[PDB]
């Protein structure tokens, strides 16, 4: 698929940089015709087929295709796509309250505060999984707050750069995100499905409740080895006043066998979550 090849600067003005990663930089922008504000994500293109730098067009098109499908309060939405020789530029919904990662660095949350966030994340993921979309990169850095100066911040899931349609129940691809958050099947290069996201939610929940990462080692290989072995425990110093039901919820997500792991529907019916 080809995208708009007019200069994006003809139609938008950019402002504050929101952040950057290995292949993308995201800048606040404003559409000239409407005054409405967006986040412009500049994704660097591959400049030869055998190169390892930039993002392959296949990978860019997959992210765009997935984003075009989604419309839900807890997920980022796509406004427009432009491209030039160097970049594909996604004009995305602006979420200006910062990363859940940074919000957490300020606070450990109460179970109420944790479940307020978690319920939104679960609602977003329920929507995605209902459409057979696995996100594959869920972590606090990819959860953005709309406004962080309110008692119960609303959130949106971002960064669909690893997301895939799972129309055959699994994908077998060497899809691989951040060691602290990837499921054992990712670590072991096994077929992957919606279940991998549920593991990541378990890790996120552990972090929300304790401020500690359950599998984090001193090096990435240690973290990955810990994940594969399900080497985590609930340290009493962090979890002494955490309910047994909260621990139960986490325990049923951090399960090595994807078939035995709670699904998104299970998570919404679990007694810690269910109203
Ligand atoms: O740092 C990032 C960032 O801030 C955002 C973002 C912020 C607000 C939005 O409204 C939409 C996206 O996306 C990203 C996507 C990446 O692939 C890598 C990043 O580093 C960011
Ligand atoms: Cl994004």
Swiss-Prot record:
ATP binds at residues 18-26, 41, 93-95, 99, 159. Ubiquitinated by the BCR(KLHL20) E3 ubiquitin ligase complex, leading to its degradation by the proteasome. Removal of the C-terminal tail of isoform 2 (corresponding to amino acids 296-337 of isoform 2) by proteolytic cleavage stimulates maximally its membrane-blebbing function. Induction: Up-regulated following treatment with IFNG/IFN-gamma. Isoform 2 is expressed in normal intestinal tissue as well as in colorectal carcinomas. The active site is at 137 (proton acceptor). It comes from the Eukaryota. Residues 12-273 form the Protein kinase domain. Belongs to the protein kinase superfamily. CAMK Ser/Thr protein kinase family. DAP kinase subfamily. The autoinhibitory domain sterically blocks the substrate peptide-binding site by making both hydrophobic and electrostatic contacts with the kinase core. Interacts with KLHL20. Interacts (via death domain) with MAPK1 and MAPK3. Interacts with MAP1B (via N-terminus). Interacts with PRKD1 in an oxidative stress-regulated manner. Interacts with PIN1, PDCD6, BECN1, TSC2 and STX1A. Interacts (via kinase domain) with DAPK3 (via kinase domain). Interacts with GRINB. Interacts (via death domain) with UNC5B (via death domain). Interacts with UNC5C (via death domain). Calcium/calmodulin-dependent serine/threonine kinase involved in multiple cellular signaling pathways that trigger cell survival, apoptosis, and autophagy. Regulates both type I apoptotic and type II autophagic cell deaths signal, depending on the cellular setting. The former is caspase-dependent, while the latter is caspase-independent and is characterized by the accumulation of autophagic vesicles. Phosphorylates PIN1 resulting in inhibition of its catalytic activity, nuclear localization, and cellular function. Phosphorylates TPM1, enhancing stress fiber formation in endothelial cells. This is Death-associated protein kinase 1. It comes from Homo sapiens. The lineage of its organism: Eukaryota, Metazoa, Chordata, Craniata, Vertebrata. The gene is DAPK1. The chain holds residues 2 to 277 of 1430 of the full protein.
């Amino acid at each position: 698929t080809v995208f708009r090849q007019e200069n994006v600067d003809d139609y938008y003005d950019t402002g504050e940089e929101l952040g950057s990663g290995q292949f993308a930089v995201v800048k606040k922008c404003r559409e000239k015709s409407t005054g409405l504000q967006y986040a412009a994500k500049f994704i660097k293109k591959r400049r030869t087929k055998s190169s390892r730098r930039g993002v392959s067009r296949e990978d860019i098109e997959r992210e765009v295709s997935i984003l075009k499908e989604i419309q839900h309060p807890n997920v980022i939405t796509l406004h427009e796509v432009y491209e030039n020789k160097t970049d594909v530029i996604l004009i995305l919904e602006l979420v200006a309250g910062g990363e859940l990662f940074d919000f957490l660095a300020e606070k450990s949350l109460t179970e109420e505060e944790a479940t307020e966030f978690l319920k939104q994340i679960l609602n977003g993921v329920y929507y995605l999984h209902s459409l057979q979309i696995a996100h594959f990169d869920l972590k606090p850095e990819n959860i953005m707050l709309l406004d962080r100066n309110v008692p119960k911040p609303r959130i949106k899931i971002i960064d669909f750069g690893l997301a895939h349609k799972i129309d055959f129940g699994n994908e077998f691809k060497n899809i691989f995100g951040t060691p602290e958050f990837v499921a054992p099947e990712i670590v072991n290069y096994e077929p992957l499905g919606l279940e991998a996201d549920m593991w990541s939610i378990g890790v996120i929940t552990y972090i929300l409740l304790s401020g500690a990462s359950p599998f984090l080692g001193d090096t990435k290989q240690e973290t990955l080895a810990n994940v594969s072995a399900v080497n985590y425990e609930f340290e009493d110093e962090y979890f002494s006043n955490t309910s047994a039901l909260a621990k139960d919820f986490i325990r049923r997500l951090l399960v090595k066998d994807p078939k035995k792991r709670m699904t998104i529907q299970d998570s919404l019916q679990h007694p810690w979550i269910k109203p």
